[PDB]
Design a protein around this ligand. Structure first.
Ligand code: FON
Ligand code: FON
Ligand code: GDP
Ligand code: GDP
Lengths: 427, 427
């Protein structure tokens, strides 16, 4: 259970508050703490204290009282990082808290890399990659549904389901992984008949998951929306009135941005109604819609506040493009309520299984679940007819390898880096 | 030791972090905690737990897992508020932390008024008014010297010294407070000779303190500086290049502002060098200096970047006003280093006793120490010659009343309000 280098970090948000937490972790941490911590009543040393036990004392830079704090000892595996840690919670002043962090840093600790604490929690096996990512997802969450999704993932709901898939991928895999030497007349009395039934129910279980990512990505990172249109359309004017940037409506988040339009849930084409000289740029809107059939298209006719006649003009833009058109005054803010309601339509019209089925989020998992079900189909369709008995065991191990990668069974230490660099120093 | 209404509050700074602390306190708080907290391994209830003991469990809104937290039980008088409190430290996401606070609020707690926690700590007598104010002073501190000053006051250094004054004000006061009935031929063999010596050493001890406020106010709330001059002088241009607003230089803070000039440590008069048509507004600068003799005056000749000749002009502004003049280009930033150095001169030239003498800060204390030494002089000079023996006991009780007010011996519950309204919700 090797401990890491002692590391320290401010664990609470930057700013002014009643209290802050400096948290240190790693090899010999509470011996280090003892050099600077001094118990106020009696001298019960921290290194002598039980886990989950709090101590009121003072921090010192040699006769220089840094602050009055409360030290929380954690021991053994029974901590967040699953190593030795103490957590000073001090007065929540920026100058004070910074002094505390420095004191730790001067007396043995190094500054924590971003997400290193959770990284250690995963590496020590207290928590898995899903759960690790879930911690991050919760802290950054800005929607209720995003928050609730991370709670589920932290609780491990997905991990349970994925563990229930590793089940057959241990069962049916090791069943053929023992063809190594004992292959003379190996059977289980019509055994391959049940193996196909194991895979068919196994692959369909993976498919139920790969499906939820459509809803999941929306809940996690919101409905990605592009605002298109030629210069002077009103793009800027709409953007800041609706609030790279995002806003919330009907418990759903919308990521507004410009430029990769491949992968974009909703396209809003802005064109200045009755103002456009060259109005056959509705040919342009016809070929945006055509180039992104997966997206939801929505034609936003701007500058409705002038020319009070444009009902026929709206219908002409509609008919000429086959898209849906909405009249908008981005300056005044007219019909915006109607535009917003049309935007909230995207989530409403999708699918969504019985709420028991947990939503998979994050591209990484999706792609792996795909890679798994492809290897599963390779065993199902490509191999299961007349093909060999050694190449089939390759595909099954490939699937178990893929399902396991999402939970961290196979550590990539670059998959980890992209995950934890996303975290902030302190977690 | 009457407990207050259970109150809850986010105790950590607003924002995004690894961890946050919701802290609740008051009557029956850990019974309330128990309705929502659920220990993860075993069911050791919080209300059954020892003080200074931490518990890892989950918060719930009835089958709805709010978060995975760690509860810290505090009991009896042995807590910050000196009442029953638990402190949940949860994942530091704004959505999460807010959910936690709501859970507390829905299950018995009310939202804490600002500074109520420290208010309770003072009211329960765990801590005094000085120490109470010191907590605030530390959290808001933005200078090292401001930080170190609050630490001293939190440690109680001033309180010790002031307690050492309450000494004689109990000794010499009750010595004459027993003239109530036992006055027939009361003596202590030439007793009044030592009483004057008690007061003379007592009043001079108060005077040592009233003196430190000159340095103290600077350390606490910084050198208050007014930037004066007629429109188009360059006031705005200087202000934002030097950074209502304040900046730091030579470990000292400068409060820049416009208008009450009564009470202002440093006045900078800006006038556009070589640019001023009506240059006999140096009559105006002569009568600012004359109207505020206590302040430090400093004539700042702006717009030096044009007219490369103004050495003679500088000297003319100098000679015509008897002030010190500095050439400044507020736009380019020339001679600003020289202006800053002249500003740092104010703190350097003052007094400062041997560093053992603690700095009194805060107008409130100052005025009270004055009120005390005035009552002390009333006993010393007004009374001690031929005056009565009943009116002398009035002045001595007045001094003890004044010295005691600064430490909270006499609670004003409006003195308290102005102090704690200054605090933020959570402390
Ligand atoms: N003071 C504090 N420190 C933390 O590290 C922390 C909080 N609070 N609040 C939220 C909590 C959530 N995460 C956890 C998870 C597990 C453990 C832990 O000590 N693990 C033991 C539990 C066994 C037990 O005591 O019942 C384990 O062996 O799993 C600590 C924090 N968390 C971090 O965000
Ligand atoms: N978790 C936490 N809670 C707090 O309330 C708190 C921190 N940390 N860190 C800084 C500390 C400073 N203030 C104090 C002061 C006294 C006590 C206290 O429990 N008083 C007992 C001490 C006796 C003992 O255990 O030795 C007393 O009777 O005076 C708690 C916090 N503080 C708040 O800002
Ligand atoms: N009358 C009117 N003018 C608008 C409206 N929206 C934008 N404009 C004007 O059109 C100009 C360009 O708009 P802008 O949002 O910057 O479009 P963009 O440059 O393509 O992002 C601005 O100077 C606005 O004054 C609108 O709804 N009504
Ligand atoms: N060349 C030059 N122009 C300046 C300087 N300082 C200010 N100005 C100009 O003087 C004008 C008024 O300055 P301002 O700071 O607003 O003075 P205030 O209105 O009295 O606060 C501005 O428009 C500046 O362009 C300087 O140091 N050099």
């Amino acid at each position: 259970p090797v401990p890491g280098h002692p590391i320290a970090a401010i664990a609470t948000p930057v700013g002014v508050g009643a209290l802050a937490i400096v948290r240190i972790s790693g090899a010999g941490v509470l011996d280090l703490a003892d050099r600077v911590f001094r118990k106020v009543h009696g001298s019960g040393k921290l290194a002598e204290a039980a886990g989950y036990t709090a101590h009121f004392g003072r921090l010192y830079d040699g006769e220089e009282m840094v602050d009055e704090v409360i030290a929380l000892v954690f021991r053994a595996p029974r901590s967040f990082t699953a190593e030795q840690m103490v957590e000073f919670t001090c007065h929540g002043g920026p100058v004070v808290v910074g002094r505390v962090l420095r004191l730790m840093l001067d007396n043995g600790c190094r500054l924590a890399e971003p997400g290193e604490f959770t990284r250690r929690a995963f590496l020590n096996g207290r928590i898995d990659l899903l759960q690790a990512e879930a911690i991050g997802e919760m802290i950054h969450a800005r929607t209720e549904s995003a928050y609730r999704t991370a709670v589920s993932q932290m609780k491990g709901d997905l991990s349970v389901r994925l563990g229930g898939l590793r089940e057959q991928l241990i069962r049916s895999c090791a069943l053929i992984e023992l063809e190594l030497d004992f292959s003379e007349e190996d059977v289980e009395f019509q055994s391959r008949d049940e193996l196909t039934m194991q895979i068919e129910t196994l692959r369909s279980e993976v498919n139920r998951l790969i499906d939820s990512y459509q809803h999941g990505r929306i809940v996690s990172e919101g409905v990605s929306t592009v605002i298109a249109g030629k210069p002077n359309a009103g793009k800027s004017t709409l953007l800041n009135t609706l609030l790279e940037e995002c806003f919330i409506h009907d418990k759903t988040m919308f990521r507004l941005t410009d430029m990769k339009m491949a992968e974009a849930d909703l396209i809003l084409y802005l064109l200045d109604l009755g103002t456009e000289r060259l109005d056959d740029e509705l040919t342009e809107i016809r070929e945006l819609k055509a180039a992104h059939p997966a997206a939801k298209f929505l034609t936003v006719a701007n500058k409705l506040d002038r020319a009070a006649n444009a009902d026929a003009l709206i219908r002409a833009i509609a008919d000429g493009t086959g898209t849906e058109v909405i009249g908008i005054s981005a300056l005044n803010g007219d019909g915006i309520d109607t535009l917003k309601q049309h935007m909230g339509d995207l989530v409403k019209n999708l699918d969504k299984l019985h709420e028991a089925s947990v939503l998979v989020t994050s591209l990484r998992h999706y792609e792996a679940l795909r890679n798994a079900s492809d290897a599963l189909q390779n065993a199902l369709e490509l191999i299961a007819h007349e093909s060999e008995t050694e190449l089939i065991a390759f595909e099954l191990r490939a699937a178990l390898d893929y399902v396991g990668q999402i939970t961290g069974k196979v550590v990539n230490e670059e998959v980890l880096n992209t995950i934890f660099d996303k975290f902030c120093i302190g977690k």
